[PDB]
């Protein structure tokens, strides 16, 4: 077959967890592969020493990384009959880049080397709820989760509310045209995963 | 106003001398900055070093170079143009069109990739057969470099045969770009002095507006 399943959603939506749980369950009965690089973090640090990293260049750094993971792991897995689960796919780029002022149509063209998923789950949830949950986890908000480059003044919590809110707007815009399966991430991880397992379970026959 | 002047041509075409010779002349009257496409910067080095043990596809190479160029363009080229400099580029985005498309990257995709970059006010294509460029390299008594021979695409060829085949493919891309990109086609078979006088006439009339 070769089935591409993508997960999208804001940081704190639990999509990573839902992706892993899906793989672990799909492994029981089918070959499956679950999908950033250190150098990206090195580019950002060095860029900070340099007083410049444009949204354009930021977009292209991530596309470069994605092209490598796509051509090295995703596409070959797919060609050889794996189910591929991607925790974050091209739609993450569409949102990350367009919120920074990069023309989304250009981003679409940029990533047009990559196939559309067979299924994309959008785990949709209020940023307020995602923040509350990260707050109960006692975990600190990373600069990237707070859109620190866009909102350099703010507390990480306020940054996160605004930045993840902007990301949500782009995801909501893609739903109809990209055929996202929207999942209410207000639900528990168990309810969400059971619902997803039943849905993908339409590969069982 | 800032002006961008690009030179394109194969290795051995002399386009680098022509770019330098033009810079030596414009410099006498105006602020000019000479850059080379091949002068990659810091992003290029971080990514390639970090991936030195991995085999990269032509697509990923294409993107590393566009990424590095996007930074060069915003950091150096564009502000120099905005400041009224004349920018001369010894090879420009058209060199990436050729290097990438010859290695199977869709050329329309590559054009869209570099659409953030302005087109040159003038592009001089210093056109010469690979055979003549090869003879000139041989007479100079230096070796053909693997990159000049497209040794990644043609590892089973001698440097000379690799040069002829690879530079022949680059020539084909450039020829195919002439009409859409309004290249000024210069006969690179003429003397360096004669070629330069033509370039200076075209550039003179451009700066004269």
Swiss-Prot record, chain A:
Listed CDD domains: TMPK (cd01672)
MF GO annotations: ATP binding; dTMP kinase activity
EC supergroup of this enzyme: transferase
Catalytic activity: dTMP + ATP = dTDP + ADP
GO biological process, one term: dUDP biosynthetic process
One Gene Ontology cellular component: cytoplasm
Keyword annotations from UniProtKB, A to Z: ATP-binding, Kinase, Nucleotide biosynthesis, Nucleotide-binding, Transferase
EC number, UniProt record: 2.7.4.9
InterPro entries, sorted: P-loop_NTPase (IPR027417), Thymidylate_kin-like_dom (IPR039430), Thymidylate_kinase (IPR018094)
Pfam families: Thymidylate_kin (PF02223)
Binding site for ATP: 9-16
NCBIfam families xrefs: DTMP_kinase
Family: Belongs to the thymidylate kinase family.
HAMAP family tied to this protein: Thymidylate_kinase
Protein name from the UniProt record: Probable thymidylate kinase
Organism expressing this protein natively: Sulfurisphaera tokodaii (strain DSM 16993 / JCM 10545 / NBRC 100140 / 7)
Gene, per the UniProt record: tmk
